[PDB]
Amino acid sequence: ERPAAGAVINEAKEQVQQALNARKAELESAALNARLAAETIDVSLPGRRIENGGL
Amino acid sequence: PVQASLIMGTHREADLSLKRVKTLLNDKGYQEVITYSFVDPKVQQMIHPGVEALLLPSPISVEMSAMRLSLWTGLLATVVYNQNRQQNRVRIFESGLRFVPDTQAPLGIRQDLMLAGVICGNRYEEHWNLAKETVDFYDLKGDLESVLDLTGKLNEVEF
DSSP assignment of B22-43 equals HHHHHTTT-EE----SEE-HHH
Method: X-ray
Q: Is residue B120 within 8 Å of B135, Cβ to Cβ?
A: yes
Resolution in A: 2.5
Q: Is B58 left (phi over 0), alpha (psi -120 to 50) or beta?
A: left
Which residues are within 8 A (CB) of B138 and not within 5 positions of it... i.e. 6 or more apart? none
Please report the sign of the dihedral spanned by the C-alpha atoms of residue B101, residue B104, residue B110, residue B114: negative
On whether any CB of chain A is under 8 Å from the CB of B91, the answer is: yes
Q: What's the 3-state SS for B58-73?
A: CCCCHHHCEECCCCHH
φ, ψ for residue A41, nearest 5 deg: -125, 160
Q: Which of A46, A48, A53 sits opposite B29 (nearest CB)?
A: A53
Question: Residues of A6-25 as b/e, b for ≥16 C-beta within 10 angstroms?
Answer: eeeeeeeeeeeeeeeeeeee
In angstroms, the CA B116 to CA B72 distance is: 7
CB burial of residue A50 (10 Å; 0-12, 13-18, 19+): middle
Whether residue A53 and residue B129 make contact (CB cut-off 8 A), yes or no, is no
| 3-state DSSP assignment of residue B80 | helix
Residue B17 to residues B13, B23, B151: CA-CA distances in angstroms?
A: 10, 10, 10
In angstroms, the CA B116 to CA B79 distance is: 13
| 3-state DSSP assignment of residue B125 | coil
> What residues are paired with B67 via a beta bridge?
B38
In angstroms, the CA A55 to CA B96 distance is: 14
Pairing of strands B38-39, B31-32: unpaired
Closest chain B residue to A51 measured between Cα atoms? B29
In angstroms, the CA B58 to CA B72 distance is: 24
Closest chain B residue to A47 measured between Cα atoms? B129
